[PDB]
Design goal:
Structural class: alpha/beta
Number of strands: 9
GO cellular component, one term: extracellular region
CATH architecture: 3-Layer(aba) Sandwich
Subunit structure: Monomer.
Radius of gyration: 16 Å
Shape: globular
CATH class: Alpha Beta
Order of helices and strands: HEEEHEHEHEEHEHHE
Largest sheet: 6 strands, mixed
Pathway: Xenobiotic degradation
Number of domains: 1
Enzyme class: hydrolase
Family: Belongs to the AB hydrolase superfamily.
CATH superfamily: Alpha/Beta hydrolase fold, catalytic domain
Distance between the termini: 17 Å
Helix content: 25-40%
């Protein structure tokens, strides 16, 4: 277990910012992806896990940027990427996600980097929107040492992720008409029998319901942070926040399995 920061509350997790001061930089020479921004805590008081976040088809870092400061402020290094092409498919997005994690591991070993010695390279997580969410699930299927996955409105050509053993939180958007819940997010969720998993559907949400500028940042932020704290840090202080039905008028559906309180 790798417990960092104060004992959590509903209030401290719903807030815009967690306890740590966040800085960021632009990756100089991206290795295996288009562009990256690294968000990091300046005063975490220990090494922190790393999370790589990938946008959807046509999209850039702006769509997923809000997660950087939100997660970093609770004790993570977060890299948000632009893909080599905005028209990359999910397999490519997954390779590029794992390339961003690789470079964060590299920068951890680079004395000139702001994140020199700040990362525990044994503790990594994946997130992303739509095809980037599909890519996060492919990353998890291919890399079972990953500690957590928290894709949003995921799409893949196949809904069968039955091999995934990584703790997986799926954010779904009730009224998604790009990747409908009934044909994407929910069948992806249903396919996974071997993991701690959760399904949180946002009431009236369109396809962008968990993107930068969403009106549910208190709820989505709290669940995203709690999931990553619980599973990346093995921080049982977050067991209730991670596993609980949040009991919110913004949630139209909640499912969870193998998630202990």
């Amino acid at each position: 277990s790798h417990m960092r920061g104060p004992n959590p509350t509903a209030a401290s997790l719903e807030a815009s910012a967690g306890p740590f001061t966040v800085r960021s930089f632009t990756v100089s020479r991206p290795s295996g992806y288009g562009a990256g921004t690294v968000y990091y805590p300046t005063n975490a008081g220990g090494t922190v896990g790393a999370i790589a976040i990938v946008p959807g088809y046509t999209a850039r870092q702006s769509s997923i940027k809000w997660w950087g400061p939100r997660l970093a402020s609770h004790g993570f290094v977060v890299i948000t990427i632009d893909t080599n092409s905005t028209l990359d498919q999910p397999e490519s997005r997954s390779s590029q996600q794992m390339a961003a994690l690789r470079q964060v591991a590299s920068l951890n070993g680079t004395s000139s980097s702001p994140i020199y010695g700040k990362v525990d390279t044994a503790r990594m997580g994946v997130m992303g929107w739509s095809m980037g969410g599909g890519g996060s699930l492919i990353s998890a299927a291919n890399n079972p040492s990953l500690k957590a996955a928290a894709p949003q409105a995921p799409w893949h050509s196949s809904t069968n992720f039955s091999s995934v053993t990584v703790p997986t939180l799926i954010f779904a958007c009730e009224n998604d008409s790009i990747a409908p819940v009934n044909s994407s997010a929910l069948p992806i969720y249903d396919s996974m029998s071997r993991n701690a998993k959760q399904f949180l559907e946002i009431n009236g949400g369109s396809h962008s319901c968990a993107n930068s500028g969403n009106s549910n940042q208190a709820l989505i932020g709290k669940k995203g942070v709690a999931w990553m704290k619980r599973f990346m840090d093995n921080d049982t202080r977050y067991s209730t926040f991670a596993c609980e039905n949040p009991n919110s008028t913004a949630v139209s559906d909640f499912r969870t399995a193998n998630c202990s309180l």
